Each structure stands twice: as structure tokens, then as C-alpha cells.
Design a protein around this nucleic acid. Structure first.
Lengths: 137, 79
DNA sequence: TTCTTTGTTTGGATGCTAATGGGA
DNA sequence: ATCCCATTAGCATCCAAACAAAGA
């Protein structure tokens, strides 16, 4: 009855039951969309089915995937996540250079850099945080 | 009825040799035939293939016209 | 069902990293 | 508000499965 073995058995069970319904990893993620105000990528469904998420993350998706499966075998507000958008190469090189000059640009510098690269403030802000991560590794 | 996949250049061409080897040499399995045609095909010149590659195009066009909504959906077999 | 080929399409896997949560 | 960074989550990409033909 171990937390991990149940989670362990559900991914397997889930998958079989999924292939049974002749359902694609992508279809399930799509179906979660209607249901919870946020879609789930094919990547996420695959990782789930293969035990490649954190324990915490998996335990949280179990319920959503379980409800969906059952509902399918029978037969001041929040925001929907921002779509992930790649950093074009030219921008990458520029941001890459600015990072060398310094890793802690300020708000206005961030606003400046973004304005200069014709990029969204927030994206640039987030990039310096993430690139600062990739650094300390 | 279930909609089959349209034939590619190799499938069109092999369709020919298949008989001109099967009847010519019975008791032989399609497996061995496929192996052979396989080898023979990868030896044809872009000029010897061109007509089958061309006929394959028409077959592909013919397929869409007759199945405007067909989408290939291979399903990961159960195992 | 398998046995076999090529070519074509699609599913699923996975690096890298983008975006989020929520603490402070 | 801010700002910070441990977490969560997906674009891009690449590889291998499915499948047409045929009929033992």
C-alpha cells in the first residue's frame, strides 16, 4: 500500500487503460484542457506515464488523470498559463552578451534591454533569473 | 469500410516484380521476395524510379480526393 | 496475427529552458 | 506591489512504430 507503489501502479494501469480506449498521449492532454482551465502537454502525459515527474508533481496530477479516465471509460482571477515561446537566436546572442556585462540588471535596465531587443519586459526579467540558474550549475 | 494507406513509390513498383517472381518462382515466401525487391529498388537510378515516384504522387492525390478527411492514425498495438 | 521490403506519417521520448508558485 | 528561485511544464527534435501489397 506504499505511496510510491500505488503511484507506481497507477501510471502502468493508467497507460494500459489509455491505450485501450485507443487514446493518444496528446489526446488526453487535450481533454484535460476542457476540464481544468489549462491544457497539459504530450510531454507531461508521457513523463507521468513513465515515472519522470517529481513525486510531489505526480501525486498532484494523479487525481486529475484519474477523474478524466473514469469519466471516459464510462463512455482577481487566475490566468491560463502563458504559452511557452522560444527566444529567437539573434536575441539569444544579445541577451547572452548582456549577461556577461552583468547578471543582476535592474528593473529599468531590464526594461531597457527588453525595449532594445523588442521583447516583453517580463520575459527578459525571467530570462535573467533562469540564466542565472543555468550558471550556478 | 476501413481506409487503407496510399501506396508509396516502392510499394507501387514492387507490386510489379512481386508477380514476376512469385509466379515465376513459387513456393518462395513473400518475405524473401520483399528482401529481394528491396535490394533491387535501392539500386535503381533516380531515372528508373521517377515513373513510380510519379505514379505514387497521383495515387496520393487520388486518395485525398476520395477521402478528403482521412488522417493516418497508427495505433500503438497492445503489448 | 507473423513474415519482409521502402517510404511516409505519426506516436512517443527528452534535452533544454521557459514560466509559475509562493515564500520573503 | 517586488524579487527570488525551487518547481513545474512544453517547445523542438529525433527515433522507432505502424502500414500500405501479397498470401504462405
Amino acid at each position: 500500500p506504499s505511496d510510491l507503489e500505488e503511484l507506481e501502479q497507477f501510471a502502468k494501469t493508467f497507460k494500459q487503460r489509455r491505450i485501450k480506449l485507443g487514446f493518444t498521449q496528446g489526446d488526453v492532454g487535450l481533454a484535460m484542457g476542457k476540464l481544468y482551465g489549462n491544457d497539459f502537454s504530450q510531454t507531461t502525459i508521457s513523463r507521468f506515464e513513465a515515472l519522470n515527474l517529481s513525486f510531489k508533481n505526480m501525486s498532484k496530477l494523479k487525481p486529475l488523470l484519474e477523474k478524466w479516465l473514469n469519466d471516459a471509460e464510462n463512455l482577481g482571477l487566475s490566468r491560463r498559463r502563458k504559452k511557452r515561446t522560444s527566444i529567437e537566436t539573434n536575441i539569444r546572442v544579445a541577451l547572452e552578451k548582456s549577461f556577461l556585462e552583468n547578471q543582476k540588471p535592474t528593473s529599468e535596465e531590464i526594461t531597457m534591454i527588453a525595449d532594445q531587443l523588442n521583447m516583453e519586459k517580463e520575459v527578459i526579467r525571467v530570462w535573467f533569473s533562469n540564466r542565472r540558474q543555468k550558471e550556478k550549475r | 469500410d476501413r481506409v487503407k494507406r496510399p501506396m508509396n513509390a516502392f510499394m507501387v513498383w514492387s507490386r510489379g516484380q512481386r508477380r514476376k517472381m512469385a509466379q515465376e518462382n513459387p513456393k518462395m515466401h513473400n518475405s524473401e521476395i520483399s528482401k529481394r525487391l528491396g535490394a533491387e529498388w535501392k539500386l535503381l537510378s533516380e531515372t528508373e524510379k521517377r515513373p513510380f515516384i510519379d505514379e505514387a504522387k497521383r495515387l496520393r492525390a487520388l486518395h485525398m480526393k476520395e477521402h478528403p478527411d482521412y488522417k493516418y492514425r497508427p495505433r500503438r498495438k497492445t503489448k
